Amino acid sequence: DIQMTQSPSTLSASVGDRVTITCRASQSISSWLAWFQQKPGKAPKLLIYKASSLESGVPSRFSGSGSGTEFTLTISSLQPDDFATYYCQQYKNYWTFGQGTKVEIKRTVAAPSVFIFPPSDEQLKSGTASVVCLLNNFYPREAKVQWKVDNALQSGNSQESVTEQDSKDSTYSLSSTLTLSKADYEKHKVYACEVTHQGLSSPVTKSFNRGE
Amino acid sequence: PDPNANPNVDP
Amino acid sequence: QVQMVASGGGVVQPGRSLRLSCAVSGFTFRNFGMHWVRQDPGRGLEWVAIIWYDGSYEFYADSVKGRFTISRDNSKNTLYLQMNSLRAEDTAVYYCARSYGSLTGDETKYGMDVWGQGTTVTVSSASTKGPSVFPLAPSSKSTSGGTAALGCLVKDYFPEPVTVSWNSGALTSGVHTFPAVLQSSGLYSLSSVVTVPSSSLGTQTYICNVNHKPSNTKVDKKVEPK
């Protein structure tokens, strides 16, 4: 199987910038390379066929080049309608795709607002405990959420979920949920959420004591 | 046939 | 306008069957080869099957060989994918795609051009279960400045989707409903949160309206501040 690889996986850019995405193939695919555009919730759209040929109605701000094992998609001036995920596809031996490159909107750094929620009494009566840590309205997307339980770094008992970039302010929001049993929740006192983001001077810690 | 050959009609 | 729509997706248990169909418009269906392509939860695209224009040749990916069948009714202008012995790895959005629409023969290799709308296929040994809605109450540990945060945890449901509104749709500004994550139990968990003025936590009412139609579960949960 001819393996396709794209770089980068995420690309922060602004309107009017010159954006370049690279696609590499494990074997020489000559010029049988295609670039697809996919917007969230929609099906992919064909933009460039045969490495360099633009499809009908595709804006001339898109360009493609390359042959053999290295290919390139260039957007000479990023427009609002170009923020999406771009996939390359070889069609020499069957059809295989790259993992995708997400073009996101760059904005100013926005530090997250950290909120913590202890488990409700209703959930505890069901035998399970969930503590939620919320990071609201932040950019860039990279943030670290460490859970500490009585000064002990947790591992494997947390699940994170991130929203898409907000259409108004281009920020991200994040929830990290620590799931424990009611018994294990009643064995510890201090539950903390440590947030590290490049918009914060020092990392933020939101802690609560069970039964406060 | 090669699966990547012409899968369309010949006019 | 070349356009296509796939349908027939649903939620089945491992080893069962499912038939997908694709409707077309704006082109002569019987003149082009057709593809089935799927997209896994990790947004990865993988080819499934191709069928020649006249149905004379069919090629399948190794993952689906022997279990899937691609076919077409060139009189009803419809593409079919019959699946049996479904696996959890087959969980994806299935698209139909037309092979590149060149009727010249100048090229030696051919890809795809127009993709139809996808249909969602979910294969899981989990059974239909309604969600438990727990309030995420606001407090000082959730009040930064004048902005307080509240929400509802929607836990242990199957399958997707769940719909969450606030105050029956009256509260929409500042609402973040997070994507569902799949727990090790095979069930989904989700949180919906909203930021409000902290000065309105003893004067306004906030209720989270969860609706899980696959289980006929409509739940309204008042969230009171600690």
Q: What is the DSSP string of C32-95?
A: S-EEEEEE-TTS-EEEEEEE-TTSS-EEE-TTTTTTEEEEEETTTTEEEEEE-S--GGG-EEEE
Q: Report whether A115 contacts A195 (CB < 8 A).
A: no
Rounded to an integer, what distance in angstroms lies between the CA atom of residue A167 and that of residue C16? 40
Rounded to an integer, what distance in angstroms lies between the CA atom of residue A73 and that of residue A93? 21
Rounded to an integer, what distance in angstroms lies between the CA atom of residue A114 and that of residue A175? 10
Among chain A residues, CA nearest to B5: A92
Of A95, A99, A100, whose CA–CA distance to A2 is shortest? A95
Who contacts C28 (Cβ-Cβ below 8 Å, separation ≥6)?
none
Chain C interface disruption, residue of B2, B8, B10, most C CBs within 10 A: B8
Rounded to an integer, what distance in angstroms lies between the CA atom of residue A113 and that of residue A135? 5
Who contacts C102 (Cβ-Cβ below 8 Å, separation ≥6)?
B6, B8, C110
C178 touching chain A per CB within 8 A = yes
C2 touching chain B per CB within 8 A = no
Q: Report whether C178 contacts C191 (CB < 8 A).
A: yes
Of C69, C115, C120, whose CA–CA distance to C90 is shortest? C120
β A10-13/A101-105 pair status = parallel
DSSP 3-state assignment of A171?
coil
Q: What is the dihedral sign for C-alpha C53, C55, C59, C63? A: positive
Instruction: Say how many C-beta atoms besides its own lie within 10 A of residue A177's C-beta.
Output: 24
DSSP 3-state assignment of A178?
strand
Quoted resolution (Å): 2.5
Could you tell me the CA-to-CA distances from A197 to A10, A13, A164, A200 in Å, in that order?
18, 20, 18, 6
Among chain B residues, CA nearest to A91: B4
A30 touching chain B per CB within 8 A = no
* Type of residue numbered C3: Q
Residue with the two structure tokens 């795809």: C112
Q: Which of B1, B4, B10 sits opposite C109 (nearest CB)?
A: B4
Spell out the SS3 assignment of A15-37.
CCCCEEEEEEECCCCCCCEEEEE
CB half-sphere exposure, A21, CA atoms < 13 A = 34
Of C43, C213, C148, whose CA–CA distance to A101 is shortest? C43
A124 sits in which H/E element: helix A121-124
Looking at residue C145, the DSSP 8-state letter turns out to be T
Who contacts A181 (Cβ-Cβ below 8 Å, separation ≥6)?
A127, A128, A129
Q: Report whether C170 contacts C220 (CB < 8 A).
A: no
First-to-last C-alpha distance (Å) of chain C = 57
Number of DSSP helices (H) and strands (E) in chain A, helices first? 2, 18
Instruction: Say how many C-beta atoms besides its own lie within 10 A of residue A203's C-beta.
Output: 12
Q: Which of B7, B10, B11 sits opposite C50 (nearest CB)?
A: B7
Domain A4-105 bears CATH identifier 2.60.40.10? yes
Looking at residue C138, the DSSP 8-state letter turns out to be -
Named by the residue before each, gaps in chain A exceeding 2.5 A from C to N are none
A-chain residues within 8 Å CB-CB of C36? none
The maximal CA–CA distance of chain A, rounded, in angstroms, is: 67
DSSP 3-state assignment of C163?
strand
β C11-12/C119-123 pair status = parallel
Task: Among 3.40.640.10, 2.60.40.10, 3.10.150.10, 2.60.120.620, name the CATH number for the domain at A113-209.
Answer: 2.60.40.10
| C-alpha torsion angle, residues A111, C193, C156, A184 (rounded to 10) | 60
Number of DSSP helices (H) and strands (E) in chain B, helices first? 0, 0
Dihedral pair phi/psi, residue C214, rounded to 5°: -55, -25
Rounded to an integer, what distance in angstroms lies between the CA atom of residue C207 and that of residue C165? 8
Domain ranges of chain A: 4-105, 113-209
Please give the distance of CA C165 from its chain centroid, rounded to a whole number: 19
Rounded to an integer, what distance in angstroms lies between the CA atom of residue C13 and that of residue A75? 44
CB half-sphere exposure, A161, CA atoms < 13 A = 20
Domains of chain C, start order: 3-123 (2.60.40.10), 132-222 (2.60.40.10)
Of A46, A34, B1, whose CA–CA distance to C53 is shortest? B1
DSSP lists the bridge partners of residue C33 as: none
Who contacts C49 (Cβ-Cβ below 8 Å, separation ≥6)?
C35, C36, C58, C59, C60, C61, C64, C68, C70, C81
Q: Report whether A185 contacts A141 (CB < 8 A).
A: no
Please give the distance of CA A209 from its chain centroid, rounded to a whole number: 33
Say if A4-105 and A113-209 have the same CATH topology: yes
Planar angle of CA A192, A194, A200, nearest 5 degrees: 140
Could you tell me the CA-to-CA distances from C80 to B2, C35, C168 in Å, in that order?
22, 10, 41
Rounded to an integer, what distance in angstroms lies between the CA atom of residue A149 and that of residue A207? 9
CA gyration radius, chain A: 23
A94 touching chain B per CB within 8 A = yes
Planar angle of CA C174, C180, C182, nearest 5 degrees: 160
Q: Report whether C139 contacts A119 (CB < 8 A).
A: no
DSSP lists the bridge partners of residue A195 as: A145, A204
Q: Which of B1, B3, B8 sits opposite C53 (nearest CB)?
A: B8
